[PDB]
Enzyme design. Structure first.
Site, mmCIF file in Angstrom:
data_model
loop_
_atom_site.group_PDB
_atom_site.id
_atom_site.type_symbol
_atom_site.label_atom_id
_atom_site.label_comp_id
_atom_site.label_asym_id
_atom_site.label_seq_id
_atom_site.Cartn_x
_atom_site.Cartn_y
_atom_site.Cartn_z
ATOM 1 N N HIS A 150 -0.236 118.744 32.548
ATOM 2 C CA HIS A 150 1.020 119.421 32.245
ATOM 3 C C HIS A 150 0.919 120.884 32.712
ATOM 4 O O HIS A 150 1.207 121.825 31.970
ATOM 5 C CB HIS A 150 1.375 119.281 30.762
ATOM 6 N N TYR B 291 17.399 116.398 30.340
ATOM 7 C CA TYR B 291 17.998 117.563 29.698
ATOM 8 C C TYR B 291 19.474 117.790 29.998
ATOM 9 O O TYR B 291 20.175 118.293 29.116
ATOM 10 C CB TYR B 291 17.235 118.835 30.081
ATOM 11 N N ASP C 296 -1.883 133.585 25.830
ATOM 12 C CA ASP C 296 -3.226 133.856 25.340
ATOM 13 C C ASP C 296 -3.418 133.336 23.923
ATOM 14 O O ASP C 296 -4.512 132.876 23.584
ATOM 15 C CB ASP C 296 -3.521 135.357 25.382
ATOM 16 N N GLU D 75 10.672 113.714 26.987
ATOM 17 C CA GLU D 75 11.267 114.988 26.582
ATOM 18 C C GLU D 75 12.777 114.895 26.590
ATOM 19 O O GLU D 75 13.388 114.314 27.496
ATOM 20 C CB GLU D 75 10.914 116.152 27.515
ATOM 21 N N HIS E 202 -1.655 136.884 33.509
ATOM 22 C CA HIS E 202 -2.513 138.069 33.532
ATOM 23 C C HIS E 202 -2.297 138.963 34.736
ATOM 24 O O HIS E 202 -2.296 140.183 34.599
ATOM 25 C CB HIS E 202 -3.981 137.657 33.429
ATOM 26 N N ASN F 173 11.926 112.707 31.410
ATOM 27 C CA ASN F 173 12.361 113.943 30.784
ATOM 28 C C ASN F 173 13.798 114.191 31.206
ATOM 29 O O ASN F 173 14.078 114.325 32.390
ATOM 30 C CB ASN F 173 11.491 115.114 31.235
ATOM 31 N N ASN G 208 3.042 115.354 34.237
ATOM 32 C CA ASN G 208 4.346 115.770 33.736
ATOM 33 C C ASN G 208 5.101 116.566 34.789
ATOM 34 O O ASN G 208 4.614 117.596 35.278
ATOM 35 C CB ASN G 208 4.176 116.644 32.492
ATOM 36 N N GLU G 209 6.302 116.101 35.111
ATOM 37 C CA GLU G 209 7.243 116.823 35.964
ATOM 38 C C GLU G 209 6.628 117.371 37.247
ATOM 39 O O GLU G 209 6.741 118.570 37.526
ATOM 40 C CB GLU G 209 7.954 117.957 35.223
ATOM 41 N N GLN H 49 1.449 125.783 26.547
ATOM 42 C CA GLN H 49 2.578 126.296 25.780
ATOM 43 C C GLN H 49 2.249 126.565 24.321
ATOM 44 O O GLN H 49 2.940 127.372 23.692
ATOM 45 C CB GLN H 49 3.801 125.389 25.933
ATOM 46 N N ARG I 93 3.354 113.411 21.403
ATOM 47 C CA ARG I 93 3.008 113.603 22.803
ATOM 48 C C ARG I 93 2.493 115.030 22.977
ATOM 49 O O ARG I 93 3.192 115.994 22.665
ATOM 50 C CB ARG I 93 4.208 113.357 23.699
#
Ligand code: NA
Length: 472
Positions: free
Chosen positions: A122, A311, A52, A376, A39, A309, A166-167, A19, A77
């Site tokens: 991740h 939300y 990228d 998160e 891509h 995490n 992660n997740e 990310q 983190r």
């Protein structure tokens, strides 16, 4: 009291490698499944965006540390890019440039009084490993162990907080749709379960590796970051309550029952519903993979804390919907959102802060009050520095967490906001903003600038309390 953080509680912010880093093929880094997706399949991503360059944190890591220091973060983190360290996925070649990069980041953090918390995986699987089938192929558990060994050996003298994965609830879905999360494979209700199985095995191998090869010397802690939505009964009926328990078990319990309970194994409801559905559809074998008793014992107890995490929330009612086969259909709940809940810039994310407290209590009761690190929590908008919605989201969620701690006795030990900065939001590209710092993705220098939420979080981190103006 209910507005003050416990003295030892750790506050900070979070990112993930694909990310933020960019430098996707620089200095020996090998390709991962997100390089491949962005891509080859720009039609899957808003704006045909790629990682990228992203925030260019491969080059700009000192700027990330600068803003962490401004914020007053105690913990950062971040994740490590597997293919930056092991470009071929397997451990035959270690890329010194990648070792150097993460050492440089870790050393810069420590020099600025910020503790590193490292997510090993991740979502950025090396393409060479996806080409063997990726997560549905159990051979990846040993490959994951070998990757972790490289990480512990190189970084574990200075890193004392680790998350294996992660997740996996999210990334397993990359095996449940042809147009979704990398690697965008359409094996719902079959390949996603195989992926989960491998991940659980991998996590356990990594934990045992730490015990055997590193813990005595390094003295750190190993957990895993699991996402979970609160699921509120649509009505107060026993039937709707049952559906919400199904939701918890099919989303959190899938991963947490094998690891965090004394019994281990998958939740009974998961095993039983999938077995019944598989039989009814004519399969000889259940679509849910099985653990042997020896595996159950190996896997259970492989934790030093639980990463969460959190939300949002859903409403759950009794019933079944979704395609056959799929995890959602197997789970035996009909999910909706309440129209009254405040919105975000993300279709899936509604503001339901009391759900956070409910979830923390559910976890306390199910898993015997494990230490919980909130890895998160955060909120999306489309842009802007005067991010009042994000400020409200944070202050309300932190208030609810503090009630869980002080009123309900939940052992929450830390919290990292998602995210330090606006970044590549997966299939949403750069269209959804989760940062507390804004980033100009049209400026090659990628300047990070504080939003109001960064200022408010700095105030919370400095004072160690919720400011009066945000209290009820
Ligand atoms: Na090495």
């Amino acid at each position: 009291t209910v507005y003050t953080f416990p003295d030892e509680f750790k506050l900070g912010a979070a990112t993930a490698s694909y990310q933020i880093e960019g430098a996707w093929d620089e200095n020996g880094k090998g390709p991962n499944i997100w390089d491949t997706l962005t891509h080859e399949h720009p039609d899957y991503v808003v704006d045909g965006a790629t990682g990228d360059i992203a925030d260019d944190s491969y080059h700009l890591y000192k700027e990330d540390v600068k803003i962490l220091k401004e914020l007053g973060a105690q913990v950062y983190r971040f994740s490590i890019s597997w293919a930056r360290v092991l470009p071929e996925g397997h451990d035959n070649i270690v890329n010194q440039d990648g070792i150097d990069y993460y050492n440089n980041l870790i050393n810069e953090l420590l020099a600025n009084g910020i503790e590193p918390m490292v997510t090993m995986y991740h979502w950025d699987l090396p393409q060479a490993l996806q080409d063997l089938g990726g997560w549905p192929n159990l051979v990846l558990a040993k490959y994951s162990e070998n990757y972790a060994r490289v990480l512990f050996k190189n970084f574990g003298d200075r890193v004392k907080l680790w998350l294996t994965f992660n997740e996996p609830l999210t990334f397993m879905d990359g095996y449940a749709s042809e147009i979704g999360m990398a690697p965008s494979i359409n094996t719902p209700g079959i390949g996603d379960y195989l992926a989960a199985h491998t991940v659980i095995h991998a996590h356990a191998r990594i934990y045992h590796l730490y015990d055997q090869e590193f813990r005595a010397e390094q003295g750190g802690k190993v957990g895993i970051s699991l996402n979970i939505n609160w699921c509120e009964p649509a009505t107060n009926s026993a039937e709707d309550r049952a559906s919400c328990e199904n939701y918890q078990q099919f989303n959190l319990g899938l991963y947490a029952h094998p690891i965090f309970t004394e019994e281990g194994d998958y939740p009974a409801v998961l095993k039983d519903r999938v077995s019944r559905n598989s039989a009814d559809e004519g399969y000889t074998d259940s679509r849910l993979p099985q653990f042997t008793a020896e595996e159950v014992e190996y896997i259970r107890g492989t934790h030093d804390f639980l990463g969460i995490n959190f939300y949002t929330a859903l409403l759950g009612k009794s019933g079944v919907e979704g395609y056959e086969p799929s995890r959602y259909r197997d789970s035996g709940v009909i999910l909706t959102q309440d129209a009254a809940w405040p919105i975000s810039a993300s279709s899936w994310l509604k503001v339901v802060p009391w759900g956070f407290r409910k979830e923390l209590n559910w976890i306390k009761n199910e898993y015997n009050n494990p230490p919980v690190f909130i890895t998160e929590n955060g909120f999306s908008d489309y842009g802007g520095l005067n991010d009042t919605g994000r400020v409200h989201y944070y202050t309300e969620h932190l208030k609810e967490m503090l009630k869980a701690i002080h009123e309900d006795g939940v052992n929450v030990i830390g919290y990292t906001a998602w995210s330090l900065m606006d970044n590549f939001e997966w299939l949403r590209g750069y269209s959804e903003k989760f940062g507390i710092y804004a980033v100009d993705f049209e400026d090659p220098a990628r300047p990070r600038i504080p939003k109001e939420s960064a200022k408010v979080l700095a105030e919370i981190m400095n004072t160690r309390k919720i400011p009066e103006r945000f209290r009820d």
